[PDB]
Design an enzyme around this catalytic site. Structure first.
Site, mmCIF file in Angstrom:
data_model
loop_
_atom_site.group_PDB
_atom_site.id
_atom_site.type_symbol
_atom_site.label_atom_id
_atom_site.label_comp_id
_atom_site.label_asym_id
_atom_site.label_seq_id
_atom_site.Cartn_x
_atom_site.Cartn_y
_atom_site.Cartn_z
ATOM 1 N N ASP A 180 0.859 -1.210 0.000
ATOM 2 C CA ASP A 180 0.000 0.000 0.000
ATOM 3 C C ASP A 180 0.888 1.251 0.000
ATOM 4 O OD1 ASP A 180 0.446 1.462 2.507
ATOM 5 O OD2 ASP A 180 0.299 -0.530 3.301
HETATM 6 N N1 NAP Z 1 4.448 2.492 10.034
HETATM 7 C C1 NAP Z 1 3.570 3.151 10.775
HETATM 8 O O1 NAP Z 1 3.757 3.459 11.943
HETATM 9 C C2 NAP Z 1 2.247 3.546 10.130
HETATM 10 C C3 NAP Z 1 1.208 4.278 10.863
HETATM 11 C C4 NAP Z 1 -0.092 4.688 10.295
HETATM 12 C C5 NAP Z 1 -0.344 4.341 8.922
HETATM 13 N N2 NAP Z 1 0.700 3.612 8.197
HETATM 14 C C6 NAP Z 1 0.381 3.285 6.797
HETATM 15 O O2 NAP Z 1 0.426 1.881 6.544
HETATM 16 C C7 NAP Z 1 0.847 1.634 5.185
HETATM 17 C C8 NAP Z 1 1.990 0.668 5.141
HETATM 18 O O3 NAP Z 1 2.351 0.444 3.794
HETATM 19 P P1 NAP Z 1 3.361 -0.705 3.419
HETATM 20 O O4 NAP Z 1 3.600 -0.852 2.004
HETATM 21 O O5 NAP Z 1 4.579 -0.776 4.226
HETATM 22 O O6 NAP Z 1 2.331 -1.870 4.059
HETATM 23 P P2 NAP Z 1 1.432 -3.145 3.898
HETATM 24 O O7 NAP Z 1 0.932 -2.672 2.699
HETATM 25 O O8 NAP Z 1 1.172 -2.979 5.281
HETATM 26 O O9 NAP Z 1 2.591 -4.124 3.535
HETATM 27 C C9 NAP Z 1 2.513 -5.454 3.923
HETATM 28 C C10 NAP Z 1 3.077 -6.151 2.725
HETATM 29 O O10 NAP Z 1 4.260 -6.920 2.900
HETATM 30 C C11 NAP Z 1 4.056 -8.267 2.554
HETATM 31 N N3 NAP Z 1 4.537 -9.195 3.619
HETATM 32 C C12 NAP Z 1 4.088 -9.421 4.899
HETATM 33 N N4 NAP Z 1 4.833 -10.367 5.469
HETATM 34 C C13 NAP Z 1 5.715 -10.712 4.573
HETATM 35 C C14 NAP Z 1 6.738 -11.652 4.621
HETATM 36 N N5 NAP Z 1 6.918 -12.371 5.723
HETATM 37 N N6 NAP Z 1 7.588 -11.848 3.496
HETATM 38 C C15 NAP Z 1 7.451 -11.133 2.318
HETATM 39 N N7 NAP Z 1 6.429 -10.219 2.300
HETATM 40 C C16 NAP Z 1 5.567 -9.994 3.394
HETATM 41 C C17 NAP Z 1 2.572 -8.443 2.180
HETATM 42 O O11 NAP Z 1 2.406 -9.051 0.914
HETATM 43 P P3 NAP Z 1 2.883 -10.545 0.543
HETATM 44 O O12 NAP Z 1 2.206 -11.399 1.528
HETATM 45 O O13 NAP Z 1 2.459 -10.699 -0.900
HETATM 46 O O14 NAP Z 1 4.415 -10.519 0.648
HETATM 47 C C18 NAP Z 1 1.942 -7.057 2.276
HETATM 48 O O15 NAP Z 1 1.142 -6.765 1.132
HETATM 49 C C19 NAP Z 1 1.119 3.050 4.595
HETATM 50 O O16 NAP Z 1 -0.035 3.519 3.811
HETATM 51 C C20 NAP Z 1 1.384 3.888 5.841
HETATM 52 O O17 NAP Z 1 1.296 5.270 5.617
HETATM 53 C C21 NAP Z 1 1.979 3.213 8.776
#
Ligand code: NAP
EC number: 7.1.1.1
Length: 175
Positions: A104
């Site tokens: 995302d």
């Molecule tokens: N970080 C914070 O504190 C915080 C706070 C508020 C909002 N947010 C929001 O949250 C969102 C995070 O985005 P993002 O891209 O990092 O998040 P995600 O979209 O949360 O990413 C998770 C992705 O990683 C993969 N994954 C999970 N475990 C895995 C593993 N063991 N091995 C390989 N792949 C794995 C998944 O797909 P697969 O299973 O296909 O690999 C999944 O689609 C952003 O929009 C951000 O602004 C973050």
């Protein structure tokens, strides 16, 4: 269909042989193997003369200033690393984008169409680079996993598999 062919074997080009890319540490990346994979990658490969910054909201994964840990806790640097709003430069010259484990965080829906179930924002215009390596199994949910057709233009995309298979075949064992 989509717009790719070779899996990690392709990374070797956008990764271990791509003048300019951007390691985008997503959720898998650091918790996949990239943490130490893109770590040695960003080193044994940046030395070849290739750039490597990080295209990801300052929260692509668990905590916020965490995806930078795999970069720091591993060995890769964060000085050539741009969080989000500053990625307008990383992808300005990166003829690629190793989008590792993100989901995302790169939702280009904001870049393609706001129709997405969410609203997107200034993601990391990753598909807007030469190639892109979205490494993950397939149904990557993430915080949205919605609009992300980015995998339909010039060899820019996702490489089914685990982020651990990403740098292991390209920077750790191409042929
Ligand atoms: N970080 C914070 O504190 C915080 C706070 C508020 C909002 N947010 C929001 O949250 C969102 C995070 O985005 P993002 O891209 O990092 O998040 P995600 O979209 O949360 O990413 C998770 C992705 O990683 C993969 N994954 C999970 N475990 C895995 C593993 N063991 N091995 C390989 N792949 C794995 C998944 O797909 P697969 O299973 O296909 O690999 C999944 O689609 C952003 O929009 C951000 O602004 C973050």
């Amino acid at each position: 269909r989509s717009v790719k062919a070779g899996s990690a074997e392709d990374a070797a080009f956008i990764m271990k042989n791509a003048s300019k890319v951007i390691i985008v540490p997503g959720y898998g990346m650091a918790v996949a193997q990239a943490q130490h994979a893109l770590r040695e990658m960003a080193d044994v490969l940046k030395k070849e003369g290739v750039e490597v910054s990080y295209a990801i909201h300052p929260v692509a994964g668990r905590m916020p200033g965490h995806m930078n840990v795999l970069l720091a806790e591993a060995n890769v640097p964060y000085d050539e690393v741009f969080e989000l709003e500053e990625i307008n430069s990383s992808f300005q010259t990166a003829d690629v984008a190793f989008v590792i484990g993100a989901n995302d965080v790169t939702n280009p829906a904001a870049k393609t169409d706001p129709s997405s179930p969410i609203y997107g924002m200034p993601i990391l215009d990753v598909e807007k680079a030469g190639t892109v390596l979205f490494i993950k199994r397939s149904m990557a949910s993430g915080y949205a996993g919605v609009e992300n057709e980015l995998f339909f233009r010039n060899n820019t995309m996702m490489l089914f598999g685990d982020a651990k298979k990403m740098t292991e075949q390209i920077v750790q064992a191409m042929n």
